[PDB]
Copies of this chain bind each other. A is one copy, B any other.
Amino acid sequence: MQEITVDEFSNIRENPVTPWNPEPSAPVIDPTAYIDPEASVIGEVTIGANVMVSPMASIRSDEGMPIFVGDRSNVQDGVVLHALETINEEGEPIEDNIVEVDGKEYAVYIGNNVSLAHQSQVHGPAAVGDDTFIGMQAFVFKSKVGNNCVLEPRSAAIGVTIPDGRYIPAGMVVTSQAEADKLPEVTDDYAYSHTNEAVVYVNVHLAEGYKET
């Protein structure tokens, strides 16, 4: 006779053992967060309250760790998070690939009320301040996006530091500090000036709603 045992979250796995990762860690997920069954969370990850991780998302902390997703933020469909090796095989920090936020080191840091829209990708080292909207298909790698910024659909920041309150126009691929520093300011009449607030609201409500059903 058979006896079946079911794991309801085989998609929320843990870290594998590698020369740089001898002891597997597993995602720490706040109870209020909603991880879609078809999303994938692996390794040293920390998801906060009310985070809404949509289908096909892939948060994978197995090379560079850890990845942090703040409260009220959201990881939409297709979004991918990953980072470059933060530790070598001798247990030595690979400083170049580590970002620091408030005295804590991270391979990827997503603050609070941050929107990683459909298809965007953020790759460590990286940091994205609170209330920032990473638009559809955007890309952020080896950069530091400040607070209240807005990367419109298709923009990309690579190896630069976006100051707070700036926005990168659709399709613009920023790769020099000179350019970053000249980015436009988010004003009250800027089209995406309020997009984040709305997206956040919707997603936060989607999280709990999806939690019953």
Contact = CB atoms under 8 A, between A and B. Distances in A.
A38 interface: yes
A210 B141 CA distance: 25
Interface residues of A, number: 59
Given A16-B210, A175-B170, A58 B85 contact: no
Interface in A50-79: 54-56, 58, 60, 62-63, 76-78
Contacts of A137: 121, 137, 139
A187 interface: no
Interface of A: 1-4, 10-11, 13-19, 21, 24, 36-38, 40, 42, 54-56, 58, 60, 62-63, 76-78, 80, 82, 84-85, 118-119, 121, 123, 136-137, 139, 141, 153-154, 156, 158, 170-171, 173, 175, 198, 202, 205-206, 209-213
